[PDB]
Design a protein around this ligand. Structure first.
Ligand SMILES: NC(=O)c1cccc2[nH]ccc12
Ligand SMILES: NC(=O)c1cccc2[nH]ccc12
Lengths: 265, 265
């Protein structure tokens, strides 16, 4: 992969692996989300970030936390196909940063998907959110385009829609979900993609067999720790549309909420 | 990737991804095992398979893994390129064997080696059978005629018989269940998932002070999508050695047994 000519975005190509595809022999949405995070890490590495915080974030013990992921897929890449992903970052005042991605077919150059993510700043020890510092923002404004470049430019698009809280009784549920070592990142935290897989565990088999996942929006509220247990709840709100809630198995503390949209095959 | 000059083996290079590494910022053994299966799949694709022969598909016959043995000297770091060469060899009517050699792309030094034993099974009845003459003759043209073993040693660890763990186990991880991410494109649990499940019962203290050097896993029965697994581990020993048993919750039907060897960091 490499930074583009103007140094303000990054591109990388991936060959879809055999173990990265589902029953329809095209890449799963968890494989897509892993590729989004991988090209995001290579972008930060290419501009000098920690091997992904700045000089001042490191001394203040500040980190980036994902607040929201929104993915829209038109065509999932087949096993053996090459998918090219371009990513870039943009600041959003003191509220946080945004990282967008565009997925393309390498042969046709056609856009097969797009994604947007909202990141917030948090003290790694206290887990307290704190907006963005005056001279912390100055350290990374040089690696972001100055004019707005949005993957979802539409006014009032699906990526910014507020998600309600699912009320019991849920229509479908998958309970007692627990992470294993494969689910941890290099910092021993549960990987953000694991939450996507957990949301989708409560989608009935019949839906997965007759429909294709087109849109997923996931809010991140609290992390599931290595010794926590998760319940995945899903209710139909309708194409097929669903409301989702991940909560810790005991007290019922919310960790995530989201919606999915599905097209009939 | 590509077949080598003589067409009797296959080589492929992989850049280690950010989400593929553990706390030591080097690739996990599950990432290694996924790469072994990926280069295995590209080798079969390059020789005309899709991965059974013309007679196997007609007779509803498939390849099933009976044993995996991996030995790692140095795990590839995040961002490093690892080159893997793989080949197959027939072992008479018992079945076939696929071996792999892992190398550092920059230094050319061997950083690991693996061997696997495969058997033939009727996909519907789940009944094992010896390889027939007409099925064997179909793939003998893609295997070297002289023996080429990743583990040539007089009495190497790859062929050692593994005993059955007796209760009470020293360590256990109970109620392990697969999710959709764990399934392959045929809706069967991925062979690498069993490795992760064996390692769930290794105490945290071991993982922090030791490095996994050797893993041998026998495969006996599959865990189905609605099955629940218990992972049991007992110390059998500078080095640390363990005996492992995976069994279904309830009746306690064995699905796997194995051993691991660990060196102090
Ligand atoms: N990945 C990051 O930490 C990041 C944050 C803000 C702007 C950026 N531009 C390239 C990478 C990056
Ligand atoms: N992977 C396979 O299906 C296979 C089986 C037997 C011999 C082989 N030689 C290359 C690939 C291969």
């Amino acid at each position: 992969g490499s930074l583009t000519e103007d140094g303000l975005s990054y591109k990388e190509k991936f060959v879809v692996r055999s173990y990265e595809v589902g029953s329809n022999k095209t890449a799963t949405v968890e494989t897509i989300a892993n590729l989004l995070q991988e090209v995001g890490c290579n972008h930060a590495q290419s501009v000098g970030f920690s091997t992904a915080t700045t000089t001042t974030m490191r001394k203040l013990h500040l980190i980036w936390v994902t607040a929201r992921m929104h993915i829209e897929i038109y065509k999932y890449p087949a096993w053996g196909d090459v998918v090219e992903i371009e990513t870039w970052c943009q600041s959003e005042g003191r509220i946080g940063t945004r990282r967008d991605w565009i997925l393309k077919d390498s042969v046709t150059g056609e856009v097969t998907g797009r994604a947007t993510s909202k990141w917030v700043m948090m003290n790694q020890d206290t887990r307290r959110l704190q907006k963005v510092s005056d001279d912390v923002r100055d350290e990374y404004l040089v690696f972001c385009p100055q004019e707005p470049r949005l993957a979802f430019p539409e006014e009032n698009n699906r990526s910014l829609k507020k998600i309600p809280k699912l009320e019991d009784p849920a229509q479908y549920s998958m309970i007692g979900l627990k992470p294993r070592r494969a689910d941890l990142d290099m910092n021993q935290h549960v990987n953000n993609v694991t939450y996507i897989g957990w949301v989708l565990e409560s989608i009935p088999q019949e839906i997965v067999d007759t429909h294709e996942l087109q849109v997923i929006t996931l809010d991140y509220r609290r992390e599931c720790q290595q010794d926590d247990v998760v319940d995945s709840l899903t209710t139909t709100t309708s194409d097929s549309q669903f409301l989702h809630l991940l909560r810790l198995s005991g007290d019922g503390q919310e960790i995530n909420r989201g919606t999915t949209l599905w097209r009939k095959k």
